[PDB]
Write a protein that binds this ligand. Structure first.
Ligand code: MG
Ligand code: MG
Ligand code: MG
Ligand code: MG
Ligand code: MG
Ligand code: MG
Ligand code: MG
Ligand code: MG
Ligand code: MG
Ligand code: MG
Ligand code: MG
Ligand code: MG
Ligand code: MG
Ligand code: MG
Ligand code: MG
Ligand code: MG
Ligand code: MG
Ligand code: MG
Ligand code: MG
Ligand code: MG
Ligand code: MG
Ligand code: MG
Ligand code: MG
Ligand code: MG
Ligand code: MG
Ligand code: MG
Ligand code: MG
Ligand code: MG
Ligand code: MG
Ligand code: MG
Lengths: 59, 135, 50, 53, 122, 86, 134, 158
RNA sequence: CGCGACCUCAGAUCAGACGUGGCGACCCGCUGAAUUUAAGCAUAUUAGUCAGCGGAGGAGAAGAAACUAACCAGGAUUCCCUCAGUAACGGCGAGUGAACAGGGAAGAGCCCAGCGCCGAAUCCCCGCCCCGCGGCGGGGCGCGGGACAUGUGGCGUACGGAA
RNA sequence: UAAGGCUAAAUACCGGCACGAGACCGAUAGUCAACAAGUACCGUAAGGGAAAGUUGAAAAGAACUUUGAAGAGAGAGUUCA
RNA sequence: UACCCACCCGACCCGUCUUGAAACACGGACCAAGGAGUCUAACACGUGCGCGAGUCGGGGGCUCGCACGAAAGCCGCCGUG
RNA sequence: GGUGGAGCCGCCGCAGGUGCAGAUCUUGGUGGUAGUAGCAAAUAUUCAAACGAGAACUUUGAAGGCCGAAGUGGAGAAGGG
RNA sequence: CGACUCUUAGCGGUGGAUCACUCGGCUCGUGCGUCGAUGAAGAACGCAGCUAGCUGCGAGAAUUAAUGUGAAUUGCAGGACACAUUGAUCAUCGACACUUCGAACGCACUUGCGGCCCCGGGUUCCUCCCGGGGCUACGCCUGUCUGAGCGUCGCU
């Protein structure tokens, strides 16, 4: 994810959860040289990324 | 008095301009008091001041200040003339009783400089060519 | 520097985005005087605002 | 800016400048000789009724 | 299909928030579509939707504030937002009693010695 | 060796970015800016070079309070009134 | 002569107030006359041109009697784009060519709620000036 | 460096005339700025002597100037208790009160009193209200005039 | 070994106000040279000018004489003409160098303190209503506060005023 | 008649907004700046600080054949030019 | 008369400072463009025009939204100087 | 005469920021020099194939070499971004 | 006529004078005389479907609602809409909004640290913890509360 740069992990976590009715194991953020905050979000093992990609439309 | 604030004697330049110990402020001390009290209470607007007591080393000037924005002053006229934004710090411009004595105005054969508005606006007028249109 | 602040990072981010060319389509705009960017920087010659 | 742009004439000078201009507003010589195309005009100090105002 | 300020103005506050949150969602997807090629058709909408969020949110703060400046309308001690913002000098001008006030001494003079009207030489 | 051989060991910084000015003049040591002068409440403008004055005065910026003041005056400073509707 | 100070008369200042006037105003500017038939029928001299108004070219290379309909309006290039008014490019791709309103005459106004009321209000102003002069 | 017969000349341009030169290309626009005041004030105070209040005959001071006479500042006080005009009333009736003149002679006193006596007589006191009582001059002496006095009221000619 | 007035003085993220930066031509306080000038030169001048600094507003300051005068007198301020480049100052030299009268623009005048008179006649802040509310104001009603007797209102202020 | 105090008006205005004009300059002139101008760039910094207007009327701005790796050409075409 | 060429006679490279420069004095590769006695005050003489023991000029006034006008006209002003 | 493509001049007056060869004058351009100085610090390259329009200069292989662990080896700071 | 060279000419470039234009200056007039802790001036960063710059704007970001205006907008797309419709666009602007610094305000400027109030989850005040909203800068005025003082007394 690209994320709004003032975001914390507990905000990114209660975001990604709220929306793609998902749940999140851990968040892990950097700031791209460009100012865009990335955040790559591990999803709990019961629960797949490759499915929730197609829901959110990416792939 | 006042003391030319320069590193050591070092009043560089010509031997007229060449002093430091013995020389005096233009204003009076009372007007300095008014200055500094009106400069503390920047909200408040300075009126005017008595003398209370003196020493060899100081003078004790007690100063009358006003809130422009006690309703006890906006609402009563006569007093409601300080409120107006013109009078913002009267004591810094030299409009106080004491503060004006320094400017050296009056009427007559001595208040001749300051015969425009003030000391400066005398000469603004005298050191100008009125070069008319039409010559 | 590898130890940057954020304030310094936010600079370069900006500066970095300011280098890209001109979109070709600009040159078709009705009333142009614009042909090439002309405020471009190169790390080696012209050394940032730092 | 303080170049002496404007100038000066005595009243009398510039009254009898008008005289001389008016006196020669007769005399078809001078008036014609400004290319003032007065040839079929009836008379030269040309007076007209006060209907015209 | 524009979400005009016609049709919102007279609607319930909680209803607007749903229609806002409808649009918010919808916007988020249009950003995805932007990255995943999408289509010119979608890449226009992203503006219409953005702005329609304004069209909405406007009405919310409009209708809040209309309402909110109706409690304290009448009450003396009211908050800064609503207090009238002309200019600092201007909000420290005298009140409009506090110049057309006159000292009673002066009124007594205005009564006894008002200015007549008169032309002269006749 | 006061040239070329010394235009060499120039690693470490005096100036940096001022949080009021924008300029690159924070003295890190003195912690006074020396374009505006920071801890100093008042700007260091300066009657002094009129050139450096006319590089940052009311006008040069956005004037995003200001530019809509003079709007409001022109027409008369009213508020809390909306033009007659349809 | 003009008179009213509070108006310009300056080679440059209204040369400027041209290719800086907003689309608001350019309408009024981009107006063309009406043909004698309409100018009679309606008591209006000239109208702002509109997208689908039928028009006769009067000046220009390819003047004629062919009533073409307007297609679009560069109010930016500040010039109109008509129907058989067109030229063939090097590739065969036909491109229309620019013409002013001022060099064109309206032969059939495309009428409307908003355009009728102008035609009334212009014709009412005309006749009020003639009734005032009377 | 002088050469062969002139004057000395101490022209005073050693200071800085250059900075503080006032040119006068206001002069004519000012003329007009003024016009519009003279103009406006009159239309505002409609029936009232445009020039201003009545002002006294008065002698110029210093020895050369003796034989001249002026509009003075305002009529004296001593002057009024005599003409029978109350000083605070005078100020409302367009009668100019200086209250700061030492009156020394009966000559210039009565001379100057006659001006008030004159003024009273040719003054149409326009009444407080329309349906008003005493001292206001009658609806005939009222209709006749709307007349502003252009030029200085009862002008003082030597 | 207490409780209570006051006086002085603290603390309050108290209730309500407000001050601070900028702009800065013009405006006001102060401060303040040296180039320069004098064929040097320091006296003088540049020049109370630049920088410095402080302060204001739609203009700024001043203003109702401790003035002017020497007349047979005038009459707040400022401004323009004028005086007048004059009275004087000065290694009386370079320079400097104003004013008084007249004419004209405009032109308005007024307020305090004290002496006294008048049940503080006053003032401030609360609460309830009546109107008013996009420059917070009137009207009333409240043993709801408080200042003020070390002094708040009216008349009055010298051109007389009080009685 | 001081030791307390206020005040319109004329009066000043290279800063602001908004205008009107000229015996003006006319792009090495005119403001540093007719344009990405206080821009590019320089100095650590105070600060310094540029150059650069014009197709035609319309992009109608060379389609297509051909030579040439490509830059470039030759025809052709467009154009009142 | 001008271009090339031909001949015969003449002939040192300008500018400048300079008693004296072709100077074994200095500036000067060449070309375009820019470029240096300006404005104001005060005198002074010379001259032109108005009126003349006067004569003026303002500054003021009276007559404009100026298109021309920020002009022109007029004023016991006109003489308060 | 040609080219150029939009405006221009004659007289009588009035008004100038008014006429360049010069100021190691200002700005921009251009020569001669001149196809001149020069592309010299570290001993070092060669062959074959690939890729390619085009190869001494790229790449792969093979061969000869150097730095030679106080390095031309492997990681960082400040700086650089 | 061999080559070079010089002069002049016939044409090719290079350069960018001259001329001709001019949305800019300059000068001179007129009208008005526009700031702020409710939070300025100034800066930072961000924001367009394709956008680097200027410019415009502010997470509600190439604008917001409204009123005129009244069909465009456009380099190319794309669009709604019903152009019998706040109805495209533009101007106006008066309706709402105001990322970060800054007099810059909780304390410092690392971008960290907090305090005190509320409301979500957590709790089920159990405290964190996670989420959300309001305050907290210095000076000073009027008032209030709480005080101090072998200051001056009073009553005990
Ligand atoms: Mg480098
Ligand atoms: Mg009183
Ligand atoms: Mg008068
Ligand atoms: Mg200030
Ligand atoms: Mg000398
Ligand atoms: Mg000397
Ligand atoms: Mg010397
Ligand atoms: Mg000296
Ligand atoms: Mg001096
Ligand atoms: Mg002096
Ligand atoms: Mg200064
Ligand atoms: Mg006087
Ligand atoms: Mg006094
Ligand atoms: Mg005063
Ligand atoms: Mg004042
Ligand atoms: Mg150029
Ligand atoms: Mg230039
Ligand atoms: Mg060219
Ligand atoms: Mg050219
Ligand atoms: Mg041609
Ligand atoms: Mg010599
Ligand atoms: Mg020799
Ligand atoms: Mg020499
Ligand atoms: Mg010229
Ligand atoms: Mg030349
Ligand atoms: Mg070795
Ligand atoms: Mg490595
Ligand atoms: Mg050029
Ligand atoms: Mg040119
Ligand atoms: Mg005690």
């Amino acid at each position: 994810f690209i994320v709004d740069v003032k975001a914390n992990k507990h905000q990114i976590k209660q975001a990604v959860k709220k929306l793609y009715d998902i749940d999140v194991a851990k968040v892990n953020t950097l700031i791209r040289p460009d100012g865009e905050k990335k955040a790559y979000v591990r999803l709990a093992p019961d629960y797949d990324a490759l499915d929730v990609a197609n829901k959110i439309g990416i792939i | 008095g006042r003391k030319r604030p320069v590193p050591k004697g070092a009043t560089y330049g010509k031997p007229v301009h060449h002093g430091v110990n013995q020389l005096k402020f233009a204003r009076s001390l009372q007007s300095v008091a008014e200055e500094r009290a009106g400069r503390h209470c920047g909200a408040l607007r300075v009126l005017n001041s008595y003398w209370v007591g003196e020493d060899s080393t100081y003078k004790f000037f007690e100063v009358i200040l006003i809130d422009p924005f006690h309703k006890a002053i906006r609402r009563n006229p006569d007093t409601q003339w300080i409120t107006k934004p013109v009078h913002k710090h009267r004591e810094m411009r030299g409009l106080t009783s004491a503060g004006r004595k320094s400017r050296g105005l009056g009427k007559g054969h001595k208040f001749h400089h300051t015969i425009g508005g003030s000391r400066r606006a005398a000469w603004r007028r005298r050191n100008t060519l009125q070069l008319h249109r039409y010559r | 520097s590898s130890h940057k602040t954020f304030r310094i990072k936010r600079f370069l981010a900006k500066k970095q985005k300011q280098n890209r060319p001109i979109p070709q389509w600009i040159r078709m705009k009705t009333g142009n005087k614009i042909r090439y960017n002309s405020k471009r920087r190169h790390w080696r010659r012209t050394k940032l605002g730092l | 800016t303080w170049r002496r742009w404007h100038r000066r004439v005595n009243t009398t000078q510039k009254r009898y400048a008008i005289c001389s201009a008016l006196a020669a507003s007769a005399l078809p010589a001078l008036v014609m000789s400004k290319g003032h195309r007065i040839e079929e005009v009836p008379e030269l100090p040309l007076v007209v009724e006060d209907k015209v105002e | 299909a524009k979400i005009k300020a016609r049709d919102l103005r007279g609607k319930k506050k909680e209803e607007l928030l749903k229609q806002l949150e409808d649009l918010k969602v919808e916007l988020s997807q249009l950003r995805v579509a932007k990255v995943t090629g999408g289509a010119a058709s979608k890449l226009s909408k992203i503006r219409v939707v953005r702005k329609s969020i304004a069209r909405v949110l406007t009405v919310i703060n409009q209708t809040q504030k209309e309402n909110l400046r109706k409690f304290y309308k009448g009450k003396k001690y009211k908050p800064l937002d609503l207090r009238p913002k002309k200019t600092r000098a201007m909000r420290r001008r005298l009140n409009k009693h506090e110049e057309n006030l006159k000292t009673k001494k002066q009124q007594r003079k205005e009564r006894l010695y008002p200015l007549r009207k008169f032309a002269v030489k006749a | 060796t006061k040239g070329t051989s010394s235009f060499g060991k120039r690693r470490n910084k005096t100036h940096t970015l001022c949080r009021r000015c924008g300029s690159k003049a924070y003295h890190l040591q003195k912690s006074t800016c020396g374009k505006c002068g920071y801890p100093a409440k008042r700007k260091r403008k300066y009657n002094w070079s009129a050139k450096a004055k006319r590089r940052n005065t009311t006008g040069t910026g956005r004037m995003r309070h200001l530019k809509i003041v003079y709007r409001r005056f022109r027409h008369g400073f009213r508020e809390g009134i909306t033009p007659k509707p349809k | 002569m003009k008179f009213n100070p509070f108006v310009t008369s300056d080679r440059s200042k209204n040369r400027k107030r041209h290719f800086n006037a907003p689309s608001h105003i350019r309408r009024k500017i981009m107006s063309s006359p009406l043909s004698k038939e309409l100018r009679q029928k309606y008591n209006v001299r000239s109208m702002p041109i509109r997208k689908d108004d039928e028009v006769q070219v009067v000046r220009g290379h390819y003047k004629g009697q062919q009533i073409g309909k307007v297609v679009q309006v560069y109010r930016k290039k500040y010039v109109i784009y008509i129907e058989r008014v067109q030229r063939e490019k090097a590739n065969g791709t036909t491109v229309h060519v620019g013409i002013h309103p001022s060099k064109v005459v309206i032969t059939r106004l495309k009428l409307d709620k908003d355009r009728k009321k102008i035609l009334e209000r212009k014709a009412k102003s005309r006749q009020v000036g003639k009734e005032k002069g009377k | 460096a002088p050469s062969r017969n002139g004057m000395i000349l101490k022209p005073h341009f050693h200071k800085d005339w250059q900075r503080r030169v006032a040119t006068w290309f206001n002069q004519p626009a000012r003329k007009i700025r003024r016009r519009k005041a003279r103009q406006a004030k009159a239309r505002r105070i409609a029936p009232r002597p445009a020039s201003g209040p009545l002002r006294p005959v008065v002698r110029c001071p210093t020895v050369r100037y003796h034989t001249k006479v002026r509009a003075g500042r305002g009529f004296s006080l001593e002057e009024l208790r005599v003409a029978g005009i109350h000083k605070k009333v005078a100020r409302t009736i367009g009668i100019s009160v200086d209250p700061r003149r030492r009156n020394k002679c009966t000559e210039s006193l009565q001379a100057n009193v006659q001006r008030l006596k004159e003024y009273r007589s040719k003054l149409i006191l326009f009444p407080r209200k329309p349906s008003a009582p005493k001292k206001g001059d009658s609806s005939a002496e009222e209709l006749k005039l709307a007349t502003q006095l252009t030029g200085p009221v009862m002008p003082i000619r030597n």
